[PDB]
Design a binder for this molecule. Structure first.
Ligand SMILES: Nc1ncnc2c1ncn2[C@@H]1O[C@H](COP(=O)(O)OP(=O)(O)CP(=O)(O)O)[C@@H](O)[C@H]1O
Ligand SMILES: [Mg+2]
Ligand SMILES: [Mg+2]
Length: 451
């Protein structure tokens, strides 16, 4: 036995928030080696809720040097005497062992590992745990592959694994290729599946779209917007449309009414967080209600798309992180949606990339608004390029259904406003400006005045 509860509450991936833990106990312990245990740990709260975490424990008969305090779980008596329990994901040999189980498509008790057909795993490469802030734990093997081990685990089909598999197996080149994964059952053999981790090809020497965009939007004296990042935005549009096309073919398309009631509920909630919104709520609602009964085509989509979710390798843009929007339940995250909502996500991201500069400057540094003008011009140029690149692949310009597109942009801006009002008041002018602009964009498109 180990004092799991005392250890887990200090971990950055632990989501207990401000809650009292009743118990933290292993639901399932699966030996991998004589000194390596896979553990499904159930944390029970006072309201009776249970949240399950995945832990891999490396046992040692004496203090091992390389483990930090955060990787030290506890101590316990075993058959040969005292043992120390370490978080095995920080052990190179243990991480390699997991990768080997994936490589072999091994089954260990109720744990099912699978290597994607034809995939090669870098079993020789040095494993190093990612230092990047996240809710899971990732081990990078050399420059070749990333093993992501999920911390909080839940029942059902994992959309990140699911959609990456579809895309990779269809030969889509705009993903970091899924190389393998592993899972178990929720309540023993014969019950709901539970995804545990994934292995993906590591995109070495890549840049995040957000970093490239902000660099472009910060270039001094760039009053005449350049063509280089527009070229990149066009290529990114190609990539997003390509991903959408593969997903549409594999997982189908259908039609639904535009979700007026859903976006209205989000508006009502947002207006409680951002009082600034009440002055615009009537106008937003009118635009949404004009779409009542509008049929929209939906399909499986990325679901949380922005410039932080795309990587530029030396050869291509890749889309990563298909888990869906962080706050939604799994069934909702696997629902089809409009591809235009993904497009809207990128357009919002361009807006923030350009205007972050302005909210960080003092008023006196842009008294005549010329940097603001440049930001607007940069967003317009790159948004147009992105949409054109999308159109080149889709064979249909997202701006054609401009009313639906603008409504999704508006819904995102309303959500952003509520967020900034709560967490970052100085950023609130960004979505508020967007709302006024998009209100006009949407009004124009509803009258079919858009180009
Ligand atoms: N295949 C790959 N090759 C190279 N870098 C990758 C990669 N997959 C992810 N990354 C990088 O690793 C980091 C983590 O990416 P990820 O999409 O998991 O962030 P995230 O913020 O969504 C974590 P969480 O969802 O838990 O909050 C990012 O900096 C991302 O650019
Ligand atoms: Mg991400
Ligand atoms: Mg993520």
């Amino acid at each position: 036995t180990l004092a799991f509860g005392d250890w887990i509450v200090h971990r950055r991936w632990y989501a207990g928030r401000s809650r009292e833990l009743v118990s933290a106990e292993p639901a399932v312990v699966t030996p991998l080696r004589d000194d390596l245990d896979h553990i499904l740990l159930d944390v029970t709260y006072t309201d009776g809720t249970v949240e399950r975490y995945q832990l891999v424990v490396r046992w040692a008969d004496s203090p091992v040097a390389g483990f930090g305090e955060a990787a030290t779980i506890g101590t316990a008596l075993g058959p040969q005497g005292e043992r120390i329990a370490y978080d095995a994901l920080f052990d190179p040999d243990a991480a390699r062992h997991l990768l080997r189980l994936v490589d072999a498509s091994a089954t260990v008790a109720d744990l099912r590992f699978t290597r994607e057909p034809g995939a090669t795993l870098p079993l020789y490469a040095p494993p190093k745990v990612s230092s990047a802030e996240q809710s899971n734990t990732s081990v990078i093997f050399g420059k070749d592959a990333m093993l992501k081990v999920f911390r909080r685990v839940t029942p059902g089909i994992n959309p990140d694994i699911e959609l990456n598999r579809v895309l990779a197996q269809a030969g889509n080149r705009h993903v970091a290729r899924l190389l393998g994964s592993f899972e178990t059952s929720w309540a023993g053999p014969g019950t709901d599946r539970c995804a545990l981790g994934m292995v993906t090809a590591f995109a070495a020497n890549s840049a995040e779209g957000w970093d490239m965009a902000t660099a472009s939007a910060r270039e001094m004296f760039a009053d005449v917007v350049g063509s280089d990042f527009a070229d990149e935005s066009y290529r990114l549009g190609n990539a997003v449309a390509s991903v959408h096309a593969t997903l549409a073919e594999a997982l189908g398309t259908s039609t639904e009414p535009f979700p007026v009631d859903t976006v209205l509920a989000r508006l009502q909630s947002a207006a409680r967080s951002a009082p600034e919104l009440a002055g615009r709520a009537a106008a937003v609602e009118e635009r949404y209600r004009r779409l009542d009964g509008r049929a929209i085509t939906v399909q499986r989509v990325h679901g949380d798309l922005h410039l932080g979710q795309v990587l530029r390798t030396p050869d291509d843009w890749l889309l990563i992180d298909f888990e869906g929007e962080p706050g939604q339940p799994l069934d909702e995250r696997r629902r089809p949606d409009s591809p235009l909502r993904d497009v809207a996500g990128v357009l919002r991201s361009f807006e923030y990339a350009a205007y972050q500069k302005l909210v960080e400057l003092a008023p006196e540094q842009d008294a005549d608004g010329r940097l603001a003008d440049r930001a607007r011009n940069w967003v317009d140029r790159n948004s147009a390029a992105f949409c054109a690149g999308y159109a080149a692949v889709a064979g249909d310009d997202p701006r054609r259904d401009g009313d639906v597109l603008a409504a999704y942009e508006l819904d995102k801006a309303v959500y952003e406003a509520a967020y900034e009002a709560r967490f970052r008041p100085s950023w609130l002018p960004i979505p508020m400006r967007s709302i006024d602009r998009i209100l006009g964009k949407l009004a124009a498109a509803l009258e079919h005045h858009h180009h």
